[PDB]
Paper text:
HEWL is one of the best characterized enzymes. Its reaction mechanism was discussed for many years, and was settled by evidence for a glycosyl-enzyme covalent intermediate at Asp52. Crystal structures of hen egg-white lysozyme (HEWL) determined under pressures ranging from ambient pressure to 950 MPa are presented. Under high pressure, the crystal structure of the enzyme undergoes several local and global changes accompanied by changes in hydration structure.
At 950 MPa, the crystal symmetry decreases with respect to that at lower pressure, and the space group changes from P43212 to P43. The a axis of the new P43 crystal corresponds to the diagonal (a + b) of the original P43212 crystal lattice. Four molecules (A, B, C and D) are included in the asymmetric unit of the new P43 crystal, whereas these four molecules are symmetry mates in the original (low-pressure) P43212 crystal, which has one molecule in the asymmetric unit. At the phase transition, the four molecules in the asymmetric unit move towards each other. In particular, molecules A and C approach each other along the c axis. However, the corresponding r.m.s.d.s for molecules A, B, C and D after the phase transition (at 950 MPa) are estimated to be 0.57, 0.70, 0.72 and 0.63 Å, respectively. However, a large deformation of the β-domain is detected only for molecule C at 950 MPa. In molecule A Glu35 takes on dual conformations, as in the 890 MPa structure. In molecules B, C and D, however, the side chains have a single conformation and protrude into the cavity to hydrogen-bond to the newly present water molecules. In molecules C and D additional water molecules penetrate above the previously present water molecule that interact with Trp108 and make a hydrogen-bond network between Trp108 and the main-chain carbonyl O atom of Trp28.
Numbering used by the authors: 1 to 129
Write the structure that this text describes.
Amino acid sequence: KVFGRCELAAAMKRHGLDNYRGYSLGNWVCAAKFESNFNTQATNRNTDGSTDYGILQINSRWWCNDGRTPGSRNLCNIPCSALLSSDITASVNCAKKIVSDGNGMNAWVAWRNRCKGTDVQAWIRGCRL
Ligand code: NA
């Protein structure tokens, strides 16, 4: 399913992402916009044989198991298909693990390129919660 901006803002907040690892909620909403266009089922194959999955485009190399990323880990202990669910609980859980591994949101290219050092507050502007 495809989220709207404030709809995603609430869903990420609900799931503990406001200010997690010190990333304001807007960073996360921003990230998803440019990672997945807010679509919970976005996948994007990488040349290294991994795939990015879901609203936050979590990668199979380290974070989720999709059973076809050679020599990979599953550090969020989830199948990559959990990250494609309309319910973003697993995606957010996993993203929290990613930013907690010392790479922070630099893990996500679209954050680095379209959110970091920007007015990410704009992505939550006018939202209830
Ligand atoms: Na994996």
